[PDB]
Amino acid sequence: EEIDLNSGSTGDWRKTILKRAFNIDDVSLFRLLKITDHDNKDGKIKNN
Amino acid sequence: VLTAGLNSQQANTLHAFLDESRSAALSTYYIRQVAKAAAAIKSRDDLY
């Protein structure tokens, strides 16, 4: 399943659990993605 | 998305407060709609 991790996307329940497990908001979760993956064009990742 | 912004202390305050508020509504719905007419269940102490 895709998880939309952009800064301004009120996503599904899967983005909420990523915020609860990591104790961050939407904005720091998009910057956590850019620290992880600079090559990611959009915000969407896989649920691997 | 608001629950994901809590720490470990405020989450345990939240989930303990929700269980006290669900039980006031689940019990009162049981007495009016679910409970049998033969058992004269009138209050929550009669439900205990």
Side-chain angles (χ1 to χ4, degrees):
Chain A
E1 292 84 5
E2 294 291 330
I3 299 171
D4 193 2
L5 297 179
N6 290 119
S7 297
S9 65
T10 61
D12 56 351
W13 59 274
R14 292 180 179 91
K15 189 182 184 180
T16 299
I17 294 177
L18 289 177
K19 292 186 287 185
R20 186 180 66 187
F22 294 159
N23 292 318
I24 49 177
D25 56 351
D26 296 330
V27 177
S28 297
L29 183 58
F30 181 75
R31 295 292 297 271
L32 183 62
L33 182 58
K34 295 296 182 182
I35 294 170
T36 296
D37 194 359
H38 296 282
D39 293 331
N40 194 2
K41 300 296 186 292
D42 56 351
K44 295 180 177 65
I45 63 168
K46 300 295 290 183
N47 197 2
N48 292 319
Chain B
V1 300
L2 294 175
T3 305
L6 299 174
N7 57 5
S8 297
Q9 183 179 2
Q10 293 177 355
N12 291 320
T13 303
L14 178 65
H15 294 289
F17 183 77
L18 292 175
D19 291 331
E20 294 179 354
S21 297
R22 290 176 182 178
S23 179
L26 293 174
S27 298
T28 311
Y29 182 78
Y30 184 85
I31 298 169
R32 298 295 299 165
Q33 297 293 322
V34 184
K36 298 293 183 181
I41 298 171
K42 296 292 183 182
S43 65
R44 295 178 66 188
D45 291 330
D46 291 331
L47 184 55
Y48 176 67

